[PDB]
């Protein structure tokens, strides 16, 4: 045999080793070709939606969902007990490669062994080809190791005018990048170290960015509280008072929260919501090019105030959906929607305005007037939190090759990184296919929890009631599912 | 009249940490220094009773 | 240990007015929601009113719609449904219950009344 | 509302099932469905939530199933204690929960 | 000093997908079931190829100041807006039954995380 | 093999509580407010020296099989049954309303985890 078989995980320390084992099985794309694809085949009826670019017949590994790493329990007992983690070491093995031919006279195909084929697998460490990891796509290995997965087709977009090129369009051959050449002899291991990133915050700050002050003590600072002395004509004065516990709207703080971008609000009973179709219109969305496309998910925000849980941002959530979910057009209840608000103490809610603005300048003839502030982009002094990861999220995306960003955490979350874990590109030879096995390993550095908090923290648990199938596990048929999305903020810390 | 340093909220990201109110924003700032007079009870009863002590001689240093 | 126990009111003439309160002992009781059903003394159960934790969402069922209100004091565990106009179509035994919850984030919700009010009789008649 | 025999009997020991039927945004769309048994005199006490989900206190015999559009209470090995009117209840569409005319069972 | 950026990018902002391949995420199609009353009903669908404008983006346009509508800056209509058009837009209030969305356009907008430009 | 006991214990098992302060347990006390038709109730009392037959203890007395009633062993009568005795009671049914709590006497005790004896 060419390896062996690793699943699991050691807990060393402040040391995760997460060891992966997984099944594949190739088919070849395109019949071993090239294409162009548009959106005029498909019938490309939008300008914000009209693409070109081409689809090759090679496939891609894609590990960079959590559920991969960790099962379920180690998942939990990371939570419950870090306060952050980030991936250090990778490791990826390539090995029990298999190549079946097809041979299908009249009803019945026979597939048997072909024993001098050939597959084709490279990394791409330069980063040279398109990049699609970052974008949370689907063909990333299954959580459950059992489960055998069909290794995606690889394709990639380049400059448009609709459905036309441009001159400064791009044509990349992956036959063109020098690519190791294996049979069922051969296996194929390669090794990568993670830049250095921050640690994932993984907790939930105990006190809000407005409560930070003593409640115990006045402020030597003051404020203005009067500008009239009661009701009649000439009634202009100036009237000060200390900031005290009495009024803490007013003390003086030193931060402030981090930037908004307001998102419409949609409530999950169904009959609070206007009777229109304002799923497109009323979204916010961003506009390059000429082309619009939805702002999703957007800025990191809380989902909604507290105490108010059946309203949702409209497009600024991560929707997962449950197993077995349609593509289509499916009810509410058979998607997942998760919620940012443990942030809701630095950051602002989604939902609502950032605060107040005063427009005109007062006078006698003229009242002091305020506006809305609807979209509020950063500001020297503000705090913010990024959004969670979860179970069922990405993990990196790579950071474009820009002139300049500013935090360039991926905003649907987890870590960014300029040199990401390459892609690894993979083909039969040119009825033919493939099958093998993949053992991924990264490691993971953690953050201990260092609490000196008197009472009990909240941990995630599973519930306790008799139910038909024990959750994050098979059900009668085989069919593996995960009942929900399971962010990491549990533990506290002091803000 | 004003201060000098602030903590920066332990947080994922801030832009220019300076504090609002001036000085010095830190990560860590100075440490906090807590202080309180030890207490000494009042002269407690002759027979054991499981309550804590509620008396206790007036001080202060 | 869970004890919902509702003081309420007993006889009182049509069109007049009520009060019906509750009092919540050994449960946190500003986390669930709250409701108030009605079974008529030969009938079954009728869902009048429920009342979120924090207050946003009151819905009423469409009967006494606009007759009722409810109200909820977190500090004092109490949690009340005051009626107006009053009909002889209402004459239940009215229960304080509350709806499962498990202590978890928010975005998950249970469909089930876990734990219920003894109950009180509430008589709405002429004579 | 949901609709639900007026009675049913059974002999001790042996398995009998109740139904609920609803319009498809109480039932059929929605999976909410909830179960109660009540003495006379008595707060209902819940025996199962969501369709098949059961509470701790709540004993083995009590089950629960959604045949689609419908919806039905399993009793197994049914004894004197088993005497009692058992409710069916559903949140709408609108949120809104809703009953049934409730079922006495009848131990003969 | 960091090294001038003299290229023009292959692909564009908002075009660094996977083409072929559907997301696991879910937005939200259609939220009136149909003409009529009382129709409010929420469906989602999967983000993909077939609509490529809901996709959800790990990183967004950068700012912008807007302008009036000769060297002309074309090549980094990639990574940035177009300074005689509209950022995008915001909604304006909070909806419900008796009351329909509202948007507004974002005529300037200042830096959020996870903006990337030229 | 161990070296013989040529000594009498001091105190009995159940003579080991302190007697001066109370234990933070509590034990049933009342089962019925007063006499009466549906009297019933459960009032909870502290163990203390007032009343030390129901204090919790961390040991029982060894293995008794009973001889019907000379060198003679009272020394041991400290940690051992009476051998002419029942070793104690067990309830041997469930009550209710309709049925009492009944009781029977352990003629024979085998060994328990923590029992001692000599």
């Not at chain 1, 409560?211 to 000439?234: A, E, F, H, V």
């Not at chain 4, 002999?11 to 109660?36: A, H, K, R």
């Not at chain 4, 959604?66 to 209470?73: E, F, P, R, V, Y």
């Not at chain 4, 409710?87 to 079922?103: A, D, E, L, M, P």
Request: hydrophobic residues 30%.
């Amino acid at each position: 045999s060419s390896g062996n078989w690793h699943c699991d995980s050691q807990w060393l320390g402040d040391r995760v080793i997460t060891t992966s084992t997984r099944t594949w099985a190739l088919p070849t794309y395109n019949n071993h070709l090239y294409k162009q694809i548009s959106n005029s085949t498909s019938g490309g009826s939008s300008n914000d939606n009209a693409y070109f670019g081409y689809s090759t017949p090679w496939g891609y590994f894609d590990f960079n969902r959590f559920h991969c790493h960790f099962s379920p329990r180690d998942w939990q007992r990371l939570i419950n007990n870090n306060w952050g983690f980030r991936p250090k070491r990778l490791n990826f093995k390539l090995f029990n490669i298999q190549v079946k031919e097809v041979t299908d006279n009249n009803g019945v195909k026979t597939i048997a062994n072909n024993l001098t084929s050939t597959v084709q697998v490279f990394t791409d460490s330069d980063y040279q080809l398109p990049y699609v990891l970052g974008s949370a796509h689907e063909g990333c290995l299954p959580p459950f190791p059992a489960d055998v997965f069909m290794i995606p087709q690889y394709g990639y977009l380049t400059l448009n005018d609709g459905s036309q090129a441009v001159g400064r369009s791009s044509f990349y051959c992956l036959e063109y990048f020098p690519s190791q050449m294996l049979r069922t002899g051969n296996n194929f291991q390669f090794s990568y170290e993670f830049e250095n990133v921050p640690f994932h915050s993984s907790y939930a700050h105990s006190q809000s960015l407005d409560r930070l002050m003593n409640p115990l003590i006045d402020q030597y600072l003051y404020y203005l509280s009067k500008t009239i002395n009661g009701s009649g004509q000439n009634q202009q004065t100036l009237k000060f008072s200390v900031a005290g516990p009495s009024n803490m709207a007013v003390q003086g703080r030193n931060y402030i929260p981090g930037p908004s971008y307001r998102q419409q609000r949609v409530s999950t009973t169904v009959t609070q919501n206007n009777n229109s179709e304002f799923a497109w219109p009323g979204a916010s969305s961003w506009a390059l090019n000429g082309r619009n496309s939805l702002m999703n998910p957007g800025p990191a925000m809380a989902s909604h105030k507290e105490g108010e849980d059946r309203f949702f941002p409209l497009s600024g959530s991560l929707i997962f959906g449950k197993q077995g979910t349609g593509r289509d057009n499916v009810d509410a209840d058979k998607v997942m929607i998760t919620n940012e608000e443990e942030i809701k103490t630095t950051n602002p809610v989604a939902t609502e305005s950032y605060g107040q603005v005063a427009t005109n300048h007062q006078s006698a003839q003229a009242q002091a007037q305020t506006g809305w502030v609807q979209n509020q982009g950063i500001l020297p002094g503000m705090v913010w939190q990024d959004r969670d990861v979860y179970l069922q999220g990405p993990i990196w995306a790579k950071i474009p090759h820009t002139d300049g960003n500013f935090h360039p955490s991926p905003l649907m979350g987890g870590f960014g990184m300029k040199h990401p874990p390459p892609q690894i590109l993979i083909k039969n030879t040119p009825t033919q296919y493939s099958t093998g096995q993949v053992s991924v390993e990264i490691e993971w550095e953690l953050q201990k929890e260092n609490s000196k908090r008197w009472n009990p923290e909240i941990q995630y648990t599973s519930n306790y009631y008799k139910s038909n199938n024990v959750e994050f596990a098979v059900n009668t048929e085989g069919v593996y599912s995960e009942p929900r999305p399971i962010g990491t903020r549990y533990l506290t810390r002091n803000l | 009249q004003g201060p000098i340093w602030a903590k920066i909220p332990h947080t994922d990201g801030n832009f220019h940490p300076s504090p609002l109110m001036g000085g010095f924003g830190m990560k860590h700032p100075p440490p906090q220094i807590l202080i309180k007079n030890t207490p000494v009870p009042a002269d407690p009863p002759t027979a054991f009773n499981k309550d804590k002590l509620n008396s206790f001689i007036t001080q202060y240093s | 240990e869970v004890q919902l126990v509702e003081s309420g009111g007993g006889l009182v003439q049509p069109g007049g007015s009520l009060r019906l309160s509750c009092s919540a002992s050994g449960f946190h009781f500003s986390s669930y929601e709250m409701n108030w059903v009605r079974q008529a003394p030969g009938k079954g159960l009728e869902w009048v009113s429920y009342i979120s934790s924090s207050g946003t969402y009151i819905d009423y069922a469409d009967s006494v719609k606009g007759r009722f209100t409810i109200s909820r004091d977190n500090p004092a565990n109490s949690l009340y449904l005051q009626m107006y106009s009053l009909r002889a179509e209402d004459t239940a035994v009215y229960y304080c219950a509350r709806r499962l919850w498990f202590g978890e984030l928010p975005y998950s919700y249970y469909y089930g009344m876990d734990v219920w009010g003894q109950g009180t009789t509430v008589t709405v008649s002429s004579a | 509302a949901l609709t639900q025999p007026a009675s049913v009997s059974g002999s001790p020991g042996q398995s009998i099932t109740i139904s609920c039927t609803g319009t498809s945004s109480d039932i059929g769309g929605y999976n909410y469905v909830s179960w109660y048994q009540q003495h006379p005199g008595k707060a209902p006490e819940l025996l199962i939530f969501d369709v098949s989900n059961r509470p701790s206190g709540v004993s083995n015999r009590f089950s629960g199933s959604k045949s689609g559009n419908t919806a039905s209470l399993t009793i197994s090995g049914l004894q004197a204690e088993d005497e009692a009117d058992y409710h069916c209840c559903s949140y709408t569409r609108t949120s809104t929960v809703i009953f049934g005319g409730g079922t006495k069972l009848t131990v003969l």
